[PDB]
Design a protein around this ligand. Sequence first.
Ligand code: IPT
Ligand code: MG
Ligand code: MG
Ligand code: NA
Ligand code: NA
Ligand code: NA
Ligand code: NA
Lengths: 409, 204
Amino acid sequence: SGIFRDVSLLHKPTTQISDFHVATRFNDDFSRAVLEAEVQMCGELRDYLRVTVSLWQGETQVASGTAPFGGEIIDERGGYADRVTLRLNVENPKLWSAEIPNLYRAVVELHTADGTLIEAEACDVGFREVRIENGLLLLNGKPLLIRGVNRHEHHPLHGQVMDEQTMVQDILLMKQNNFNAVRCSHYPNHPLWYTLCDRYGLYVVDEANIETHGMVPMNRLTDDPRWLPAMSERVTRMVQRDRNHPSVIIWSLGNESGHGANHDALYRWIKSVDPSRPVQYEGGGADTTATDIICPMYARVDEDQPFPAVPKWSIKKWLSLPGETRPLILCEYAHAMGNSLGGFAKYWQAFRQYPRLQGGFVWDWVDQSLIKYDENGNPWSAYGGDFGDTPNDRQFCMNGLVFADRTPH
Amino acid sequence: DEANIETHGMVPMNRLTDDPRWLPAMSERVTRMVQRDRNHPSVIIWSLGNESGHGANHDALYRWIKSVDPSRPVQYEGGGADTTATDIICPMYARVDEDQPFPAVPKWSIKKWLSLPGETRPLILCEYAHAMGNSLGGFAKYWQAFRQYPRLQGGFVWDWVDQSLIKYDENGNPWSAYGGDFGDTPNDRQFCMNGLVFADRTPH
Ligand SMILES: CC(C)S[C@@H]1O[C@H](CO)[C@H](O)[C@H](O)[C@H]1O
Ligand SMILES: [Mg+2]
Ligand SMILES: [Mg+2]
Ligand code: NA
Ligand code: NA
Ligand code: NA
Ligand code: NA
């Protein structure tokens, strides 16, 4: 517990940009795109205000649009006089992918017609389309093969405080070891992570901070309307913060919280508000009405584990169950606890052979060991129970592909 | 129940079946079969024939039957085993786990076939486990898959009985003959004996 992420002060004008959404849509072959940016203001509207959204490629401005406030009519009472949407045509855009993380810069200016800037906001933009078609998760029209890993925010000295150096070290090691994607197990990450993933190129699953594993049954709270409010904020506020990052390609409703009606409602809320990314959720059997992707944890390649209610079918079999058509990407597989990863090649061989088996995210990146000191000042790696915590789950906290200090296993 | 239409030796295989001029002749082979056998409960599926590629004639005929007799699915393996003229994915000799990616007409592993993008039909091999001579190795691998996968609904082994013919020696003793033993040529030798049982019905 504690104040574990940054604290800042931000001084905005009273008439200000209060939110902005960037979307990119394409033609059939990706040779043309439209960048659409909805901008919202707070403060007093005045006829002289304008918003200009400019797109840059390096030091070169490639597109721009300017307009006064006042959105399209939306219903019988009119439109949002406090919003405006700018539409920029972009020819032959440089596409973003984990392989070639091409980025442009969008600058959003709140200014006056006669040229005075009130304030500006901005973001890096990656032109990419993510869609599921014919049962395949496609990026810029090509099917992905997710070489992913689950990554918790963990430091052996600092606990859950993340720093730039460490984040960078992790991405470099992931890329160095042929990973192309990461799942934010199991909560929104420090803001800087998204920026680094956008720039260095990794596909990200952004996941809401909701996990109720210890309830009995697991969906006790998630099926209760009384908890929909609290849950809703965990999902909505995550979307509101992270929706403009290109690295984020899939939203996740949380983890190990069974399957409750609250999941369904929240799944639908995201689909409505941001049609640009698939929504996944593993709870309740990995193939519920709240997920666009079959996303089991620890389902085996050839072997079925037919548990009641929530079976873990062999992944090859799952794909073809009567009426199923979704892509399958394991949210967690290959439990890297101690001397492990046995059978990893089995997964890969399957992923390569079956189009709809589009990979998975190993569990997990780094061991959650903590440093303790022996009377003599020499440090050693500690696990559950080592701080007098009890009950505890002993070494279950170390499941990484690398030791806490980033040395590889 | 299958129409007496097979044009395997044509080049390409659908040369005649894609030719409207052969539509009439093909049409009688399918329609007269349905008119004759449609009241038998044992018939559960109609087949448009065998190894005649995939031609427009097949499409027309597949529709004809669907129209006249909705009570039974229609299958046809030609042209890739999963064309628009078949309600059932019905490959011949597709393997359990191993793909055989022939151009145009691949034979995918049956487990993989079920789940190709957009695929949703059941899969029943029209022919599998070629029992020629000392054979049937790997039979159990099919069965294990059939039982594990709902949509893998089995198959028809190739085939029941050896097509050997009896000939008599100089001494008048009989003996089992195959391709080429009648002076026939060219011929395909022993390929005519692929059965689980001998021509006299003794089991292999
Ligand atoms: C030998 C292959 C090119 S054709 C193969 O020959 C078999 C021989 O018994 C059967 O006739 C099969 O139906 C046919 O596909
Ligand atoms: Mg314990
Ligand atoms: Mg010969
Ligand atoms: Na695949
Ligand atoms: Na763990
Ligand atoms: Na089956
Ligand atoms: Na034969």
